[PDB]
């Protein structure tokens, strides 16, 4: 049990935060709990859309929530019905007149979180783990990327003996800082127990 989070390790450079707002020892804890509560309903809802990230900028009772997705349409709704309901669900949770931008992903095969989610799903749909992996690593490697790597936990195929499947291509230097490696973790509830997927995508350097 070694190696640090590839993101938390890269927050200085090649990686920015998911919440950009100053605060003092009197507010911080609150704007935080809330800021989380947001990702709460959001991730429990926008799941299908395939939410890869949720940035949150603040100014003063102003909330610049920016839901990133691959299918920006599931966000919107009929004409613009959802981005209306939810946008209202938010300001309901916290009376703070909240915005709610929406962005599409220029290739969801380069969104580590998604790739994880994808594979994590196939697992509950009872797919052959190794296949899924090799495939995923392929998709990612195909649509760009200088390297990629997927990891699944254990109890593969309901086995009593928990294992760990590999698979990876091209460079994936976790040790080099200026790597810019997106990373994503997807859970995987099951009839027999939990599994864990980890996605690594290496793109560019300096």
């Amino acid at each position: 049990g070694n190696k640090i989070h590839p993101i938390g390790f890269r927050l200085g450079i090649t990686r920015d935060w998911e919440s950009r707002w100053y605060a003092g020892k009197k507010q911080y804890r609150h704007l935080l709990l809330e800021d989380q509560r947001i990702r709460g309903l959001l991730e429990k809802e926008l799941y299908s859309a395939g939410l890869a990230r949720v940035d949150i900028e603040r100014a003063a009772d102003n909330v610049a929530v920016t839901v990133h997705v691959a299918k920006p349409g599931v966000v919107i709704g009929r004409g613009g019905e959802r981005i209306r309901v939810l946008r209202e669900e938010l300001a309901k949770l916290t009376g703070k007149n909240v915005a709610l931008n929406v962005q599409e992903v220029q290739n969801p095969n380069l969104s580590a979180p998604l790739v994880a989610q994808r594979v994590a799903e196939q697992i509950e749909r009872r797919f052959a783990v190794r296949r899924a992996i090799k495939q995923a690593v392929q998709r990612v490697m195909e649509s760009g990327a200088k390297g990629a790597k997927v990891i699944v936990s254990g109890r593969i195929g309901g086995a009593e003996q928990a294992r760990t499947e590999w698979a990876a291509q091209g460079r994936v230097p976790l040790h080099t800082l200026r790597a810019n490696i997106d990373y994503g973790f997807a859970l995987a509830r099951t009839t027999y127990g939990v599994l864990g997927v980890k996605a690594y995508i290496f793109l560019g350097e300096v």
Binding site: G8, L11, E18, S19, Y22, A23, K25, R29, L32, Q36
Partner: protein, 60 residues
């Protein structure tokens, strides 16, 4: 974190003393920070996600 015990949030302490903190994320009572209302575990976790603004990996 027994749900029944996360009743701590219950202002009514009867005596201000009895009121104690708890992780706002895991319910963990044993090592909760004030400036985050988070225990050392949950704290380490979110900090890694980058969801704790300004908080970085300190080295020196």
């Amino acid at each position: 974190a027994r749900k029944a015990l996360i009743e701590k949030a219950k202002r009514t302490p009867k005596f201000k003393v009895r009121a104690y903190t708890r992780c706002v994320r895991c319910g963990r009572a044993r090592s909760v920070y004030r400036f985050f209302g988070l225990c050392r575990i949950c704290l380490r976790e979110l900090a890694h996600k980058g969801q704790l603004p300004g908080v970085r990996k300190a080295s020196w």
